């Protein structure tokens, strides 16, 4: 396997952000069974973990996102849950969960047609910022 990260002398992060957008190439999408993130992401996800644990001075901020499709009310603890099932993964690599937050905002800004379960697909997702 791998072996755990060398003993860091400078400051471990200037802006983790730059570090986790990349690995993740854009936002967590959604699938399958509905209340979980598709294959392929948790293998993005793997990646972003070890970001984490390179850099154990920072917490991150996972925000849920959904469509406006449902009502707003139950979108924002879907959102939440959706988001939580990120922060969850995290910790099963080893990230610690306490600094990790989870926000649900349901529906508030979408970026793709609604007219079309493929956009929709794009207004669920998840985000994770450095905090």
Avoid: M, W
Avoid at 54 to 59: E, H, I, N
Wanted: aromatic share 4%.
């Amino acid at each position: 396997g791998q072996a755990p990260p060398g003993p860091p002398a400078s400051g471990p992060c200037a802006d983790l952000q730059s570090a986790i957008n990349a690995v993740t190439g854009g936002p967590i999408a959604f699938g399958n069974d509905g209340a979980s993130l598709i294959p392929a992401a948790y293998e993005i996800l793997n990646r972003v973990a070890d970001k984490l644990k390179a850099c154990p001075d920072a917490r991150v901020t996972i925000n849920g996102y959904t469509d406006n499709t449902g009502s707003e009310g139950i979108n924002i603890p879907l959102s939440a849950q959706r988001a939580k099932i990120v922060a969850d993964y995290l910790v099963a690599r080893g990230v610690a969960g306490d600094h990790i937050a989870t926000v649900g905002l349901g529906s508030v800004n979408p970026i793709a047609s609604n007219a079309t379960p493929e956009g929709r697909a794009k207004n669920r997702r998840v985000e994770i910022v450095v905090n």
